[PDB]
Paper text:
We determined crystal structures of the full extracellular segments of mouse PlxnA1, PlxnA2, and PlxnA4 from eight crystal forms providing a total of 13 independent structures that range in maximum resolution from 4 to 10 Å. In five out of 13 full extracellular structures all ten domains are resolved whereas in the other eight structures some of the C-terminal domains were not modeled due to fragmentary or absent electron density. This indicates that some flexibility is present in the extracellular segment of plexins. Some flexibility in the stalk is evident on comparison of the 13 different structures and contributes to the ring diameter ranging from 84 Å to 99 Å. All our PlxnA full ectodomain crystal structures have an intermolecular plexin–plexin interface in common. This interface is formed by blades 1–3 of the sema domain of one plexin molecule and the outer side of domains 4-5 (PSI2-IPT2) from the ring of a second plexin. The residues in this interface are conserved among vertebrate PlxnAs but much less among all plexins, suggesting that this plexin–plexin interaction may be an important functional feature of PlxnAs.
Author numbering:
A (entry chain C): 36 to 263, 273 to 626, 629 to 1039
B (entry chain A): 36 to 263, 273 to 626, 629 to 952
The structure:
């Protein structure tokens, strides 16, 4: 995954600019202290040295013109401009060293041709910051050459023009090399920043981000502070290619807007062609120029632009038009020139009957010309965090593809479409692992297969395309990547020219609709059904007539027979069929193109083992075509192998099932028959044995033979059953009905036999009578145990069973009761748990008493004969504590129960609170200390009518969380109420602000 | 001495139980084959028959429920329970017949009201041995009735509960009569002996000796074998009166100890009140309950308990306390329940915060409850041989009186006092002559005057007290019998309420110090001093003002004069005074109350005869006030009757008398005066003659007048005396000195005059000189006779008298000698008797010879001049026999004697 790359010789010698020779493919890198020439794959050929050199920016004129008194420092020479002069096979390189002098280098060896340094203007600027200077070379046929150059000046407004045109004579040894194109007192090919403007506003300067030639004009894109937080303005500056007087100078703001965000800070730009979608969107020819630009949100933070940034497009035509309209309105006498930083003041437009042509190049009046109304671009794409930093674009197959660098070293691939979407990112590559921001200069290899991209530390050759990353025709043709098509027979996503035989029928899909799927019939076969002929159909296929082979996973590959989009193939033979893990086994059935040699389509093919099913219902309900052979008692794929035609079963409905009856109750140790009902029981055929019932009891499994009366009924013979443990009274046991030794009849309901021993579970009379009347299990007095009448001897007629329930059950006892203590006021909910209580609520009611005190029981809370929940009444009585009494219904001497331990009455009290004070909002953890705090059922804590949130309770303390004082700050009462008792006290709680 | 008694109709139909109706006094006896109703004095009114009936103990259910296949025998119906149901005027009687069915009988006629017999529990037990079952009826006001019953079960642990509570409805015809108070599978008003316990130990059983209700509880006292010789344990079993579930069941051992003996085998018991002494000893109110119990020594021999047995007392309060402490420690989780025969095993107590009140009636946990540490009683009394067999008690005048039966038919009356003594037996009655043991059931008549006591053959009504047996105030009030006081005027030991007028002054003595006594002055009178007034004082007397009479033994009864406690009476008159046996004569002087008619006090009164004394010394030394009248020569009580004031003698010192002098020697036929000495000789007064001396000689009594020189000396005048006979040389004669004719002066020494004759007695010279030197009688040669110098003429100076004894005598002769023969060897003691031998031994020694053979005489054996005892020397000499020779001192020719017959040697 590694691209060709070139690193800087040193960590401080950062890269600045980059250009590729359109004809040679030679790569030129403008760097600190170095100008590099490299091969296509970034192998260095020449390293031209440009620094460092001792210098001082205060030294003006430079050391090469004058000796300097200032102290010198070894200074880095920043590349500030790098431009190929194609006509003259040379390269222009200008550094920051010595006030910004320039060099001309020969392309092949970078040998210095000349270095103009005697005239004042031969020094461009002392600024040592990149992204502030840009140049454009313009040389027609009959002209020797011209250079337009714009630069920040660093306040040295008298040292350096901000924009100017220079001579670029074909002859390197011309004395006028880099001289002003025109230079007189009041008419020169240059613009100077007025002294008054720097005085008014500093650090006022003009930064030249980008420049280009289009038609009969040159264009510069600038950023500069605005003139009366610091606000900046991004502008388009236009000049005619032929205009020594600079009378054609005109300057308009520009930017773009989307989704309520104005993007006004220019970051980067690139001239390209529209592509079909934008050409239509802009109403222009497909070979007209479009300006692609990056802007950051707003008009502030020039040195650290907002991450929120946008890619925008400006048709050159739309720009020229807005410029013409401006010229026209001005030459009609409307408004002012509106360029304060230069004109210094308000200057009114002068009306003059001059026709403003498309190629109007200005006059003496109405120039230079500014303007306030911005040129609006079409916003194509925006990001919120990974700030866009660079841009390059080109047209592939009518699609405008835009490459956008990011501050984190990512490269975005945007496909440009007009409204309403604007642009779509179809890929983002991670180019620089160190996360270094992508610099402005990006350039294509001569045939646009690669895009050269740079960071401060690195130049990297990035493939325009990585289509191979899409592994299905679907992914490939829906990626949105203009370069990517589907190479059908090679099963590969690639460029058309990368797909072999792409020009032949259906070899290359350019549209999702031109993609494949594979249909097989049958889509599954019995494992025993080998050497089958299968019918394969290829949807959306190309010519397969060259030949097709079928691959059954790893198992097999046989030559298929081809007729159109239909393929016929023989399935694996006996030796080669897969083995099934114990019902089926899937694999990918694949077609290999004989034309290309590549597998290009696939689909799942499954082998099954009807034999895997060994019960009728299982076999029948298989997902695959299986048949149950009634008599042969097996599952098969081939119905003709059943013993008789009558033996074939296809649906579960007629599978020889057991129907349910009322619950099967079986006592342990008693001889009983178990009649069963069922449906479609088979008559055992020749060589087949009869029916048995198998009981799956962990302790012991019993095998009892049975007789099948008819299709509907069965019956195990008289036998007794038992299990060891005596742990559980009611044990349900799964039973399986088998015939012929191992054929188990299906049991959908999963009917089970309940083996009961009369209470393993119930030690008490109340529990037995509680249980089902069905069991017939009942309590037997003498044993003090519980079993059926059969099981218990009749000394007398009495063994007792709850007839309807009208059976009283003696000797009630109380094990333990909750809420040991309680408040004297009462209201407490006493929870009494006993063994042998009354069966009905109505009897227990009025039964309960705590000593003298009457207690009223609660119905819902009352669990028969196990537990009684009762509410105590008003206790102010003589005794401190008293025992609890239960009277089953009559307070007979046999019939009463007394508690082992006695219930104690008290009266809880509270002395103090851990935090006395707390905030009005509340939420304070209060700790109230006292005595007998634990008593009773419920607790409610009260501070100033609004309740406290309870947490935990203890004998000693109660902890709760305070409510907001809905009240005002100050003292508040604390009321605590437990049940019926409400206790109050002098300790108070103070709410604080 | 015979009490009211009732005998059994038959020798085999033994008595079993006994109860007395507190209100009617009706006596009900539970016996074999009979229930008897009797009157207070044991006269039979109704005899209700209960047997015999054909039966077999193997027949269960009984014949009245099921036909039996077992062979039947005519069976005796033993009374096993007999209880009066006071609320419902009926009686509960349960026999051994038919597995122990019960009957209810109407009190008045013993007509059967009902006989529960359809339900299993209606049959109590097949045991046919008495003293194994006991019941207690408990019926408050709002309840219809309840019966607690405990019984031995005879191993039929599934047939019969050992302890249970039953319904006793007021309505006799109730269908639930004698039904369990509560009956369910695992909760019933009953305790059953576990099967495993009988298997482990047999013949394990529980015997219920006694039962009672006290406060809010019922109590049963049991004996049973101990569980791992056979050791038995006696226990107190307590239950709350109201507790159908029997959760209140608790059981502790009990007994008592004294003098290194543990009494642990329960024999009998009885609930009573303490009496003051025990109430203080036990620190309880005098109306709290006390359990009186009999125990035998040790914990073995249940069927024949040791004779060594004890009576003990247990305050109910002390019992309840020890039970509470047990409950408390258990409900604190300490130790086990400790009742193996029932629980079967070790069961740990369960700690639970339950307050144990005085009236705690148990819960489900920690019950039934046993224990190992015994309840110790206070030992009141013990016996070693007559084994105690029964007990009953009550309080009389603050004294706890305990009645204890014995195996030999004796009834002991014990007075209970606390430590250190414990109890004191103040009486033992023999109740049954046949020696039959006293049975357990004893009961008081309604007013506790009698105690009904029974043997197997007999019911006897025994008086609580028999105070009349004490016949003197002293015996009565020192018997130690709380019932007995002294009824002064009736001279009777009795109960206070039995003494007439007991509420009047001094009529009833409750203390020995209050015993009457009688003082008389004078306490003795001369017999001649008749019709005297005497002053009688009655100490500790009651009002005598009704009248008093004095009785002088049988002799007299005269009306006395009464002033307070003083009585004055006239002594017997001349005709009626007693005669004295020859100095005095005592009799009982008695007072008879005119109010009651009874003699009630007495004291000794003596009559004397100063006249009875007839010698001065006798009269003077009398124990009574007598005076000797010197001149009138008589003893008197009245000194003013002496002749002269000078005649009165009061002390013996001046009783006049004749004093002795050297012996008075009087020769016969010689004129001699006899001077005498004496003391306080009286001067004869007017009309009185002088003194004479009278000699009392049988032959002749001589009267010689004498002169009294002074108070000290007398002398008979010159006269000669003689007596006829010549038989005895020395004749002492009593002499009496008389004056005034017949007044004889006293002679204490009884001085006599010796009349001696020169030898009437002695024919030989040796005998005279032998006699007293005093006589002066001596031998006179010429006469060949013996008389005084005066009597024999002196031809010459020679008449011979043994000077010192150095006088040789003449013509010795030998009459006869003993040991005629002798051995040649010698050594023989020769006894020679002669007439006229030597006076001294020293002369005779060396005198004696038998022929040639020397013979040595013996000093002690030698009697002067009469006999010589001599020892012969070695005889082997020539002669066979030889004559014996005596040489008085010198072998003079006149001086030698030769034996008439000769001594022979052989």
């Amino acid at each position: 995954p590694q691209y060709s790359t070139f690193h800087s010789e040193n960590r401080d010698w950062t890269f600045n600019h980059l250009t590729v020779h359109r004809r040679t493919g030679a790569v030129y890198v403008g760097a600190i202290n170095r100008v590099y020439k490299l091969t296509g794959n970034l192998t260095i050929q020449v390293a031209h040295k440009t620094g460092p050199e001792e210098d001082n920016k205060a030294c003006y004129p430079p050391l090469i013109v004058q000796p300097c008194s200032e102290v010198l420092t070894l200074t880095n020479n920043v590349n500030k401009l790098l431009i190929i002069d194609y006509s003259e096979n040379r390269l222009l390189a200008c550094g920051s060293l010595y006030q910004g002098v320039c060099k001309l280098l020969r392309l092949d060896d970078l040998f210095i041709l000349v270095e103009p340094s005697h005239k004042k203007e031969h020094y461009l600027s002392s600024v040592n910051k990149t992204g502030t200077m840009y140049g454009v070379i313009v040389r027609s046929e009959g002209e020797d050459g011209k250079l337009f150059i714009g630069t920040a000046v660093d306040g040295k407004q008298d040292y350096f023009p901000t924009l100017s045109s220079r001579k670029l004579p074909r002859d390197p040894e011309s004395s006028a090399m880099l001289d002003y194109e025109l230079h007189s007192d009041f008419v020169s090919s240059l613009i100077k920043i007025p002294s008054d403007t720097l005085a008014l506003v500093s650090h006022f300067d003009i930064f030249y981000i980008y420049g280009f030639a289009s038609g009969g004009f040159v264009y510069f894109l600038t950023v500069q502070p605005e003139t009366p937080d610091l606000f900046y303005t991004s502008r388009i500056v236009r000049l005619c290619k032929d205009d020594p007087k600079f009378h054609s100078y005109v300057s308009l703001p520009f930017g773009c807007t989307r989704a309520g965000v104005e993007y006004r800070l220019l970051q980067a730009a690139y001239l390209a062609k529209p592509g079909e979608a934008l050409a239509q969107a802009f109403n222009i020819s497909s070979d007209e120029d479009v300006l692609f630009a990056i802007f950051s949100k707003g008009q502030k933070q020039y040195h650290h632009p907002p991450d929120d940034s946008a890619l925008c497009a400006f048709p050159i035509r739309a720009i020229n038009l807005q410029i013409k309209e401006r010229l026209q309105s001005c030459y009609h006498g409307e408004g002012n020139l509106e360029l304060n930083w230069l004109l210094g003041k308000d200057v009114q437009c002068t009306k003059a009957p001059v026709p403003i042509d498309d190629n109007f190049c200005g006059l003496d009046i109405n120039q230079p010309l500014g303007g306030s109304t911005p040129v609006e671009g079409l916003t194509l794409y925006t990001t919120s965090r990974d700030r866009l930093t660079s841009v390059a674009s080109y047209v592939y197959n009518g699609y405008s593809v835009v490459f956008v660098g990011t501050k984190s070293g990512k490269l975005k691939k945007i496909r440009a479409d007009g409204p309403p979407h604007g642009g779509v990112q179809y890929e983002m590559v991670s180019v620089f692992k160190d996360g270094s921001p992508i610099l402005r200069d990006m350039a294509f290899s001569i045939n646009q297969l690669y895009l050269y991209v740079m960071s401060e530390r690195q130049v990297t050759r990035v493939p325009v395309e990585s289509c191979e990353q899409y592994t299905t025709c679907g992914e490939c043709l829906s990626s949105g990547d203009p370069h990517c098509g589907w190479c059908a027979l090679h099963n590969m996503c690639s460029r058309r020219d990368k797909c072999q035989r792409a020009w032949e029928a259906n070899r290359f899909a350019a549209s999702i609709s031109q993609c494949m799927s594979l249909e097989v019939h049958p889509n599954s076969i019995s494992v025993s059904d080998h050497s089958r002929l299968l019918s394969l159909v290829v949807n959306d296929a190309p010519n397969l007539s060259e030949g097709i082979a079928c691959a059954f996973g790893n198992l097999t590959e046989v030559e298929g027979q081809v007729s159109g989009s239909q393929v016929i193939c023989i399935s694996p033979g006996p030796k080669d069929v897969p083995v099934i893990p114990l019902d089926w086994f899937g694999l990918e059935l694949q077609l290999r193109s004989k034309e290309t040699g590549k597998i290009f389509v696939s689909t799942e093919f499954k082998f099954y083992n009807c034999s895997a099913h060994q019960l009728c219902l299982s076999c029948v309900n298989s997902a695959f075509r299986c048949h149950w052979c009634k008599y042969r008692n097996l599952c098969t794929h081939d119905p003709t192998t059943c013993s008789f035609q009558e033996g074939r079963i296809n649906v579960s409905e007629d599978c020889p099932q057991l129907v349910p009856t009322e619950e099967i109750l079986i006592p342990v140790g008693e001889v009983k028959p178990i009649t069963l009902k069922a449906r479609n029981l088979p008559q055992p055929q020749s060589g087949q044995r009869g029916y048995e019932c198998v009981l799956s009891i962990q302790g012991a499994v019993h095998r009892v033979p049975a007789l099948r009366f008819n299709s509907s009924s069965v019956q195990c013979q008289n036998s007794s059953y038992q299990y060891d443990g005596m742990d559980i009274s009611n044990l349900a046991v799964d039973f399986a009905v088998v015939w012929n030794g191992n054929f188990i009849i299906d049991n959908p309901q999963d009917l089970k036999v309940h083996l009961y021993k009369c209470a393993a579970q119930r030690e008490s009379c109340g529990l037995c009578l509680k249980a089902d009347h069905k069991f017939e299990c009942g309590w037997c007095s003498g044993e003090r145990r519980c079993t059926l009448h059969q099981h218990c001897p009749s000394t007398s007629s009495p063994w007792l069973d709850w007839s309807s329930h009208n059976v009283k059950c003696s000797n009630p006892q109380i094990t333990e009761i909750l809420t040991v203590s309680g408040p004297p006021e009462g209201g407490t909910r006493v929870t009494i748990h006993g063994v042998n209580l009354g069966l009905d609520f109505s009897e227990i009611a009025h039964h309960v008493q705590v000593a003298g005190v009457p207690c009223t029981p609660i119905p819902g809370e009352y669990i028969i004969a196990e537990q009684i929940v009762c509410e105590m009444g008003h206790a102010v009585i003589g005794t401190t504590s008293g025992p609890v009494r239960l009277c089953i219904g009559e307070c007979k001497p046999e019939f009463m129960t007394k508690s082992h331990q006695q219930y104690t009455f008290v009266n809880p009290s509270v002395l103090s609170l851990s935090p006395i004070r707390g905030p009005e909002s509340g939420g304070t953890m209060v700790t109230i200390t006292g005595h007998y705090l634990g008593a009773g059922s419920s607790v409610a804590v009260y501070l100033g009518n609004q309740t406290c949130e309870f947490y935990g309770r203890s004998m000693n303390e109660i902890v709760c969380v305070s409510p907001p004082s809905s009240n005002g700050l100050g003292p508040v009462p604390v009321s605590v109420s437990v049940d019926r008792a409400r206790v109050d006290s002098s300790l108070q709680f103070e709410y604080i602000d």
